[PDB]
Amino acid sequence: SKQWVRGAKVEEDRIHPFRKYFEELQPGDSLLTPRRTMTEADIVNFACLSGDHFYAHMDKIAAAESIFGERVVHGYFVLSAAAGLFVDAGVGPVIANYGLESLRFIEPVKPGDTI
Amino acid sequence: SKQWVRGAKVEEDRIHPFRKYFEELQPGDSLLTPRRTMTEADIVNFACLSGDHFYAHM
Amino acid sequence: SKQWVRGAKVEEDRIHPFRKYFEELQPGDSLLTPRRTMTEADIVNFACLSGDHFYAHM
């Protein structure tokens, strides 16, 4: 199908794929980023900056009676800290983003957990 | 005394008391807010933002 | 002198200089970083986090 699918082989190419032009990107060019440890302070800083003081993230009593068992990290903070790991800072071929297509949150992310 | 005192009964109304006008507030209108857990990072953020690096907090 | 001095030529080589081992670094391996705009909020955040409320900054 000339498209990377889910379990195909990857081709890691020793430089960042955001530094390549359109005629030299192939489907299967892959990047594996470094890690980030989700701490308890990241929950507080994201809930303060955004404004999402939901009970599963800021309350400790009601989180123990919820489905998760304890208070967890936001979904949009996982979405933002994922993009913090693979965006190239310099000026290159990448112009705009403008799109997100099919997001699903599968398992919860807790404090003391690397991404 | 026509004033809520400390231990009187309350009257919760399922809309926020900061949405009523002056002619429809009655003494006794009460709101019970959601909770917030005071973590260790909150001490550091407030002491940095204000500047109060007192020894009982830092 | 087998060093880099101040105005010698450089060798920009398409991969990051902190990714090389000791046997493949040569004196004169250079990196030009991206930019960052200093703003009024940065002075406030750094003076709050560090604690230096000096009069020339605050």
- To the nearest 10 degrees (0 to 180), the angle between helices A40-50 and B40-50 is 50
Distance CA C9, CA B21 (A): 75
| Determination approach | cryo-EM
* Bridge partners for A38 per DSSP: A113
Contacting chains of A (3 CB pairs or more, <8 Å) are B, C
Which tokens belong to B25? 């507030």
Chain A residue numbers touching B48 (CB-CB < 8 A): none
| Three-state DSSP class for residue A29 | strand
End-to-end Cα distance, chain B: 46
Residue of A nearest to B35 (CA): A59
Distances from the Cα of A21 to the Cα of A24, A26, C52, angstroms: 6, 10, 45
Burial A91-114 (b: 16+ CB within 10 A, else e): eeeeeeeeeeeeeeeeebbeeeee
**What is the domain-level CATH number for residue A29?**
3.10.129.10
Nearest CA in chain C to A19: C14
Q: How far apart are CA C43 and CA B26, in angstroms?
A: 48
Q: B43 to each of A54, A84, A89, B47, B52, how far by Cα in Å?
A: 20, 27, 33, 6, 10
The answer to whether residues B39 and A40 touch, using CB atoms and an 8 Å cutoff, is yes
Total domains present in chain A = 1
Q: The domain containing residue A70 runs over which residues?
A: 1-115
Q: CB of A115 within 8 A of CB of A109?
A: yes
Say what the resolution is, in angstroms. Answer: 3.1
